Design a protein around this ligand. Structure first.
Ligand code: PC1
Ligand code: 3PE
Ligand code: NDP
Ligand code: ZMP
Ligand code: SF4
Ligand code: SF4
Ligand code: SF4
Ligand code: ZN
Lengths: 95, 156, 176, 297, 208, 48, 146, 114, 381
């Protein structure tokens, strides 16, 4: 989910864009500013909250040894989802 | 116009003759020389592209800097570059020639051969494979293909 | 347990002396060398037709760097800075901060490809398989600063090359 | 002042100098040493080029990474000039020809191109503009060079009122066309008086005019420390170089004497000691080798 | 401790201890220490006046016969008043053995050149001049061998920075490779990697 | 890949691109972080 | 945790007043010339000086030597200390004379008019360590702060 | 405080060695300007040799000036024998370097360096 | 008077010749043209980080120098590799020996003028670089042999291809030897050239073929054996005259005996792990890094800090194809070396170049620089 400064220069997933009066835009004159158009903070918000029937859930990011270190998430808060600290996936106890 | 067409065909002819007959002068500085020798070896075989094996510096078309450029040899690099007739080209090969590489923070290493000579093609790797060096040489040939010396001369 | 190369005495009967003189006057071993070179004339050469034919590689090959994503679009890198800690060239520069959803992510992930020694300690130090040294070796540039990759270039390398990187990691991760 | 343009470092190669310079005509004799001396401070130099990019290769070792930005430009197109000056804080104009071509005469080069560069840099918010004219520029001059160059000087002064105009007399260096023109001509001697200025002094003067805020709107005259007659100058060039393409305009400009302008400041007001010919003419003319110094006025 | 632990060779340990006693009692004029490491390597720490008498002994004595000079090394240790530690690695082919001969100097005391004993040293200690600044007296051709010709300083001294003080670049004004003060586009990032917990209690030094 | 196709993702490029060095679509490096030290913006009113 | 104010609202460039009375950016030559032109016209009590809370001793004695060259003794701080009597002539009547560590040796502490929790928090922590381990008797004259 | 000497026993033998080294450099400078075809005058190279000798004039230790004479001999050997190029000879003349600020005020203007 | 030439840098080498017409009176090799300050950069980097510098010293003998540094660090750590890692190290060390002797013989023939067996044997060298790329991912600088064993196990089907290579490689040695050994022009360029006596070879610090060409029966794989060289069966070629021709024959026979060793290592490869099973030195598997807490802590601390090596000094020398390659490693107790002197054979050989080229001619200097296999990366560090 890219956005654009009033200079026409694209805004990265960090939020970086050069200022209007900054000379360092001259490196993009006649060339392109290479930004990635798949913002991970937008792509992780599209994932469904996984409803599980346990109090403690585990996540390994999928794949087993192809994912991240396996972590355990407590699901005692019904107010809030329990987000995996590595992959950003989030869980909820269904009761 | 007619003269624009004539100088366009003449640019195409002289660019064909200069890219299809590149003669390299290879600086065998370090480990990248071994992979240049594999690019000359029978598998990848530079000679079938018109790229001859070990021409002399006073008639070569491209200086391949292949290996670490130390402080002790940077004037020798610039001197051999100055002895080359024009059009001369420089291919930087591997990380030490490109930016200093694994010896970037060394006291006795020139941090990239583009502090010494003007570099046309940067081939990255440690060492870049002989197939990757050959990719860089073909990209040099494509850069020679889109030169516009006589078109700009007719327009100047 | 040792052998003497070049400790043969030549014979001194008239047969072997005439053999050595025939070898001198009739150039027999020079004809042997001509015969070996003539033998290679009538062989198929080892030359592949690059760019249309490619040299054979393995799934372990260490080419151009890329940053991978999970199969949800979330990037794998969680700013732990093991890859710039182990980088023998100090080619990696990382800066991080928590982003808007609280995730531990990088704002700067730079790899100076001209400093890089392409040894792949960053992919084997990475605990989440984020940075990989993928299959691409044909990425020569015409300018020095084009070989100074920021995070956007490496994420575009991951998006460009993920279909091949994931298959190489699938073929190789049981040896790791 | 913006934060990215504050000078940092020790003034070396990888430092920041705060100069964002657009040097028009950097692929020539003065642009060579100007981009050299700007790049050793750590300046963001923008080089617009008309020629083949191969003829820009020697400008590439002159700075750090990303410091020289090459871009295309047409001298009749204001759009590419605006594309090249819209980030610069100083615009130097070094566009010139010793001869007229079929596509560009002296009026196309000395009048229309500097007026276009100065006007577009005026409407782009550029602080500093530098125009390079000739010391012998005059409206009623004998050579079309000096006539159109005086007209271009007047136009630059009336379209960029804070422009620094610089008058070098006849510049000598390694890639010049003053001592090398004399050494290869194998025209005569007349009553012509010349004081030649050295190219590193011209470059130091251009940079000290970039850095000085009191040089805005001034007109400088860059002249050497010794005036020579034409005949014994040419004989001293043949004496150093060990010897016994042209136009009529170059002959009109060799036999035109270098005028004395005391009312215009010079290299001594920009902190530049003028280097005499007797120290650097050997460095210029050692190439032409297969000595009594020249008498002044 | 069978699979993963390197096995101790007590035979070579006892033999090198006996030969260290032997060298310490034949040459008490110079031998200051004799030590044998846990992986069975012998070090003879001598006085710098006895470089030529010790090295000619081990080269020529029929129980030693250390004919080969494997390596010659200096080590910079700035916490000593004799900061440089000159290391001679010697190989006996008759007795299939290696010995280390270690001496010391500061910046200004010269060490006697061992080119009379082993001609191999003709470059090695020459390298020690280029890298450390240790002068070697009565050397035939002592000059720099590895650094550039106009290089000031000695690089392998530990008070010398990782980069130099000067860097080279081609300058087009003077048409020449020139030296300028070093300025990095990115600083070498010093990492503080030492763990604050003691790793080896065997090497624990007693406090004050 | 006709026999064993790669595992498809929503982020993998549907349009592969070749080496773009020497073109206007080439990569240009830049700092991907924001401004660190904030400056004092002086107030727009006079001091009287 | 106050180090992130060290990277906000910072004065990074010299500023002078323009014709509109607005602070505008300038170089060091212009700013120091416009200050020294006013310092050369002052003498006596025409020029004064106030030091803040975060000022080092080197700049304090720099400005004191500079304002003594103009013969100006009006050198002030913001935190008001009474000059009645000895004033600042003797160092004893404006120091923590015992020490911070000397609270460990004390048995009775009288805290007058102060809230040492938020004025000097580690001095309060040392008082609590003496209170806990040495059974210090603490009396406070002032508002009943915690 | 008794040290082993290098070549000299006191300061006078060391000044003898400094004097002969300066004589050898003074004789060498015209040949150095000639065969390297340097752009400097012979007087300017001799002033540089005088500057490089007077840079170390404060040393009152015989071993230190012994090593200085030895290093000047090595530089002279690299100059007579054409081992140095033109660049190595001209590195004594710091030409392309900017003039460093000398007073307090310009060093205050350009940065933080004392 | 007599002639003085400067064969300059137009690896790389500067040569100052004092000639007396055709003869050579003095040969001064000016080196340092590839001095990069490797063994100062080692001092600021950890042991794992200092490992890839050893690939780039003798850049035609990569895994040999990896093996020598790994043996030095494992000696200071008082740990040993598993047996399978030892057989893999000896296997790839002899493949590296084939690489280096092909480079040596074919460039020594290329400089003299026989330019054809260069092209014939670099296809075999291309196949061995494919073996390196299959085992590690890079064709030359593998960073594969590490302290503790090797980095990663052999991929399946690699040993069958090493078999198919080794079965055919003796015919390649035979056709090289057909082109050069009985060739009268090759013999006239190498027989009377650079005769080195055995006493001067021991005195000059020569090692390897430079000793064994002169009849000295010394090979460090026999006398001071390392990983499993006491368990393989091979012969050591010995010269008779100390010249360029005997050193050529010694290198051809060392290719023969390396093929013998590679056949024995293919037939005797044991099962098991490839790192030391101390996870405080060699890193754990990635499957157990992502499951175990101790293994994640050890992964973190090995790839950021590294293992602490106990304080001590060692000189570990192996038999690289150029000779005795030594590492004098000094550890101060931290996870970075205090000192790492790199002894390489080409330094002492190029020091002896001046004696070896006395009384010879100018075109014999290139033969003597060929018979000492001089890679200037290992000479200048
Ligand atoms: C019979 C055996 C084979 C003979 C030779 C092969 C046949 C082809 C002969 C003509 C080749 C093309 C003309 C010569 C090459 C020009 C290349 C070049 O750099 O030109 C730029 C040069 C100069 O162009 P410039 O002014 O842009 O110079 C660029 C360099 N700077 C700016 C730094 C000075 O062009 C010429 O000199 C023009 C030559 C004539 C153009 C063609 C006319 C018809 C020729 C038939
Ligand atoms: C007024 C109008 C006329 C003006 C004057 C011109 C007269 C004719 C002159 C000759 C022809 C001019 C045009 C030259 C070719 C232009 C197009 C071109 O460059 O095509 C490229 C093509 C090869 O494509 P490439 O990019 O190499 O692809 C590699 C594949 N893997 O290339 C090819 O397929 C082959 C290219 C061959 C080029 C022509 C042959 C060489 C010239 C012969 C005549 C001159 C020399 C005579 C002999 C000299 C002495 C021996
Ligand atoms: N003796 C001297 O050197 C003196 C020079 N001057 C003035 O100083 C300036 C620079 O001098 P100098 O270096 O010698 O001149 P050069 O001819 O060497 O350089 C001129 C530069 O301008 C470019 N240029 C020329 N004509 C045009 C055009 N029509 N459109 C676009 N670009 C063009 C050239 O590029 P390209 O390569 O494409 O042609 C080149 O980069 C000139 O204005 C000259 O009149 C003043 C006094 C003395
Ligand atoms: C072309 C340029 C090449 C540059 C040449 C560089 C070579 C410079 C080598 C430097 C050698 C030295 O500095 S050794 C001199 C140090 N001497 C001392 O410290 C002792 C004091 N010496 C002196 O005062 C000397 O002037 C004298 C002449 C010995 C005695 O004078 P005092 O008596 O009054
Ligand atoms: S980039 Fe690396 S592999 Fe290549 S020559 Fe340099 S050190 Fe050797
Ligand atoms: S491959 Fe090696 S040098 Fe390159 S970024 Fe990764 S760890 Fe650093
Ligand atoms: S790429 Fe991997 S190792 Fe590097 S900071 Fe990101 S998660 Fe850590
Ligand atoms: Zn997860």
């Amino acid at each position: 989910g890219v956005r654009t400064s009033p200079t026409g220069e694209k805004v990265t997933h960090t939020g970086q864009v050069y200022d209007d009066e900054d000379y360092r835009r001259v490196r993009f004159v006649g060339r392109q500013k290479e930004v990635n158009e798949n913002f991970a903070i937008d792509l992780i918000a599209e994932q469904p909250v996984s409803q599980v029937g346990s109090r403690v859930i585990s996540c390994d990011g999928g794949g087993g040894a192809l994912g991240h270190p396996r972590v355990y998430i407590n699901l005692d808060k019904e107010t809030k989802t329990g987000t995996c600290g590595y992959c950003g996936l989030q869980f909820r106890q269904q009761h | 116009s007619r003269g624009e067409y004539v100088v366009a065909k003449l640019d195409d002819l002289i660019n064909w003759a200069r890219r299809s007959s590149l003669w390299p002068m290879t600086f065998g500085l370090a480990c990248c020389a071994v992979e240049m020798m594999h690019m000359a070896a029978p598998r990848y075989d530079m000679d079938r592209f018109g790229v001859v094996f070990r021409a002399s510096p006073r008639q070569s078309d491209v200086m391949i800097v292949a290996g670490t450029l130390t402080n002790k040899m940077a004037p020798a690099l610039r001197k051999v570059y100055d002895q080359m007739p024009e059009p001369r080209y420089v291919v930087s090969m591997g990380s030490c020639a490109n930016g200093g590489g694994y010896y970037h923070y060394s006291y006795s290493v020139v941090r990239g051969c583009d502090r010494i000579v003007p570099v046309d093609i940067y081939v990255p790797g440690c060492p870049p494979t002989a197939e990757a060096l050959l990719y860089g040489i073909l990209q040099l040939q494509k850069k020679i293909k889109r030169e516009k010396r006589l078109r700009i001369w007719y327009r100047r | 347990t040792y052998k003497y190369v070049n400790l043969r005495e030549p014979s001194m009967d008239m047969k072997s002396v005439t053999d050595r003189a025939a070898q001198t006057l009739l150039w027999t071993e020079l004809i042997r060398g001509l015969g070996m070179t003539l033998s290679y004339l009538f062989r198929e050469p080892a030359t592949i037709n690059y760019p249309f034919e490619k040299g054979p590689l393995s799934p372990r090959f260490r080419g151009e760097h890329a940053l991978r994503r999970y199969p949800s679009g979330e990037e794998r890198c969680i700013a732990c800075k093991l890859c710039e800690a182990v980088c023998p060239a100090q080619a990696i520069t990382i800066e991080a901060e928590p982003r808007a959803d609280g995730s531990r992510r990088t704002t700067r992930y730079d790899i100076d490809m001209t400093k890089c020694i392409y040894c792949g300690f960053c992919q084997e130090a990475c605990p989440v398989d984020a940075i990989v040294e993928g299959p691409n070796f044909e990425f020569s540039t015409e300018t020095h600063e084009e070989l100074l990759y920021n995070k956007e270039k490496l994420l575009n390398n991951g998006d460009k090359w993920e279909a091949e990187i994931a298959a190489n990691i699938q073929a190789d991760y049981l040896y790791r | 002042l913006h934060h990215a343009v504050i000078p940092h470092g020790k003034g070396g190669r990888s430092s920041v100098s705060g100069i964002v310079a657009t040097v028009f005509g950097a692929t020539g004799f003065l642009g060579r040493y100007l981009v050299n001396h700007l790049g050793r401070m750590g300046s963001q130099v923008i080089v617009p080029y008309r020629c083949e990019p191969y003829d820009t290769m020697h400008l590439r070792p002159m700075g750090d990474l990303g410091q020289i930005i090459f871009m295309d430009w047409n001298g009749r197109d204001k759009d590419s000039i605006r594309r090249a000056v819209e980030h610069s804080n100083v615009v130097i104009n070094l566009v010139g020809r010793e001869w007229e071509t079929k596509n560009f005469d002296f009026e196309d080069v000395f009048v229309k191109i500097p007026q276009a560069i100065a006007q577009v840099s005026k409407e782009a918010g550029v602080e500093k503009f530098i125009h390079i004219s000739h010391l012998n520029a005059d409206i009623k001059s004998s050579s079309k060079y000096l006539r159109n160059k005086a007209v271009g000087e007047k136009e630059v002064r009336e379209t960029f009122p804070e422009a620094t105009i610089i008058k070098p007399a006849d510049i000598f260096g390694r890639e010049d066309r003053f001592l090398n023109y004399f050494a290869n001509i194998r025209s005569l001697g007349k009553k012509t008086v010349k004081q030649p200025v050295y190219i590193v002094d011209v470059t130091k003067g251009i940079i000290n005019a970039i850095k000085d805020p009191d040089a805005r709107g001034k007109t400088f005259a860059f002249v050497g420390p010794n005036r020579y007659l034409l005949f014994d100058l040419v004989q001293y060039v043949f004496a150093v170089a060990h010897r016994p393409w042209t136009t009529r305009d170059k002959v009109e400009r060799i036999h035109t004497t270098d005028r004395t302008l005391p009312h215009l400041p010079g290299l001594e007001d920009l902190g530049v000691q003028a280097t005499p010919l007797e120290l650097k003419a050997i460095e210029v003319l050692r190439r032409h080798r297969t000595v009594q110094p020249a008498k002044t006025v | 401790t069978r699979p993963t632990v390197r096995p101790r060779n007590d035979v070579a340990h006892k033999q090198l201890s006996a030969f260290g006693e032997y060298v310490a009692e034949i040459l008490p004029k110079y031998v200051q220490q004799v030590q044998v490491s846990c992986f069975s390597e012998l070090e003879i720490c001598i006085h710098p006046d006895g470089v030529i008498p010790v090295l000619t002994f081990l080269r020529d004595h029929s129980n030693a016969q250390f004919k080969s000079l494997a390596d010659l090394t200096a080590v910079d240790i700035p916490t000593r008043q004799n900061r440089f530690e000159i290391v001679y690695n010697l190989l006996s082919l008759r007795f299939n053995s290696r010995i280390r001969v270690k001496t010391y100097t500061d910046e200004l005391t010269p060490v006697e050149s061992s080119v009379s004993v082993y001609k191999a040293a003709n470059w090695y200690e020459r390298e020690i001049w280029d890298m450390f600044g240790v002068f070697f007296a009565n050397h035939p051709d002592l000059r720099r061998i590895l650094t550039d010709y106009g290089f000031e300083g000695h690089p392998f001294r530990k008070d010398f920075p990782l980069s130099g003080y000067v860097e080279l670049r081609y300058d087009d004004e003077v048409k020449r490779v020139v030296a300028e003060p070093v300025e990095l586009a990115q600083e070498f990032r010093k990492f503080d990697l030492n763990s604050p917990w003691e790793a080896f209690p065997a090497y624990r030094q007693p406090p004050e | 890949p006709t026999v064993k196709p790669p595992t498809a993702r929503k982020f993998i490029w549907t349009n592969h691109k070749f080496n773009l060095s020497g073109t206007p679509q080439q990569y240009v490096p830049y700092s991907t972080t924001r401004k660190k030290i904030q400056e004092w913006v002086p107030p727009s009113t006079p001091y009287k | 945790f106050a180090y992130d104010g060290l990277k906000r609202q910072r004065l990074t460039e010299p500023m002078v007043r323009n014709e509109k009375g607005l602070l505008t950016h300038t170089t060091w030559e212009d700013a120091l010339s416009r200050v020294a032109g006013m310092l050369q016209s002052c003498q006596g009590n025409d020029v004064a000086a106030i030091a803040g809370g975060l000022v080092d001793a080197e700049a304090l004695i720099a400005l004191k030597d500079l304002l003594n060259r103009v013969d100006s003794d009006t050198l002030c701080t913001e935190e008001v200390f009474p000059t009645a009597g000895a004033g600042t002539d003797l160092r004893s009547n404006y120091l923590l004379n015992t020490t911070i560590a000397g609270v460990e040796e004390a048995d009775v502490v009288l805290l007058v008019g102060t809230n040492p929790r938020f004025e000097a928090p580690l001095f309060n922590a040392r008082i609590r360590k003496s209170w806990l381990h040495n059974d210090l008797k603490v009396a406070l004259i002032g508002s009943p702060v915690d | 405080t008794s040290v082993k000497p290098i070549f000299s026993r006191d300061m006078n033998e060391a000044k003898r060695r400094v004097r002969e080294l300066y004589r050898a450099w003074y004789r060498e400078v015209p040949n150095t300007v000639h065969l390297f075809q340097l752009d400097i005058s012979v007087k300017q190279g001799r002033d540089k040799v005088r500057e490089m000798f007077k840079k170390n004039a404060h040393v009152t230790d015989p071993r230190v000036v012994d090593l200085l004479v030895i290093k000047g001999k090595m530089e002279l050997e690299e100059t007579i024998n054409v081992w140095k190029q033109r660049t190595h000879v001209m590195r004594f003349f710091h030409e392309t370097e900017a003039p460093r600020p000398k007073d307090f005020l310009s060093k205050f203007y350009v940065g933080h360096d004392p | 008077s007599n002639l003085t030439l400067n064969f300059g840098p137009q690896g790389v080498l500067r040569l100052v010749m004092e000639l007396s017409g055709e003869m050579v009176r003095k040969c001064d090799p000016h080196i340092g043209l590839l001095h990069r300050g490797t063994e100062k950069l080692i001092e600021y980097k950890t042991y794992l980080q200092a490992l890839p510098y050893f690939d780039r010293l003798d850049y035609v003998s990569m895994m040999c120098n990896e093996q020598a540094y790994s043996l030095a660090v494992e000696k200071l750590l008082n740990i040993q590799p598993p047996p399978r890692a030892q057989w893999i190290r000896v296997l790839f060390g002899e493949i590296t020996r084939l690489l280096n002797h092909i480079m040596a013989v074919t460039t020594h023939a290329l400089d003299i003028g026989a330019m054809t067996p260069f092209f014939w044997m670099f296809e075999e060298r291309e196949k061995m670089f494919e073996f390196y790329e299959r085992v590690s991912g890079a064709r030359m600088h593998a960073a594969y042999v590490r302290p503790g064993g090797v980095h990663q196990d052999l991929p399946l089907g690699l040993m069958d291809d090493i078999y198919e290579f080794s079965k055919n490689f003796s015919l390649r040695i035979d056709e090289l030897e057909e082109m050069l050994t009985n060739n009268r022009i090759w013999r006239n360029r190498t027989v009377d050239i650079g005769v080195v006596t055995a006493e001067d070879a021991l005195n000059y610090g020569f090692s390897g073929v430079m000793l064994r060409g002169s009849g000295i029966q010394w090979d460090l794989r026999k006398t001071q054996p390392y990983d499993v060289y006491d368990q393989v069966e091979f012969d050591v070629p010995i010269g008779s005259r100390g010249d360029c021709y005997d050193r050529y024959l010694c290198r051809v026979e060392e290719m023969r005996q390396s093929i013998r060793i590679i056949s024995q290592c293919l037939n005797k490869m044991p099962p098991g792990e490839i790192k030391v099973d101390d996870a405080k030195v060699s890193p754990p598997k990635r499957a157990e890094m992502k499951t175990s807490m101790e293994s994640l802590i050890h992964h973190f601390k090995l790839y950021t800090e590294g293992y602490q090596v106990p304080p001590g000094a060692t000189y570990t020398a192996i038999e690289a194809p150029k000779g005795e390659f030594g590492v004098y490693l000094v550890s101060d107790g931290s996870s970075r070396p205090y000192r790492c002197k790199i002894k390489a054979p080409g330094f002492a050989h190029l020091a002896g170049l001046d004696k070896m080229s006395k009384g010879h001619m100018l075109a014999d200097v290139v033969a003597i620089i060929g018979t000492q296999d001089i890679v200037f990366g290992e000479v200048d560090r």
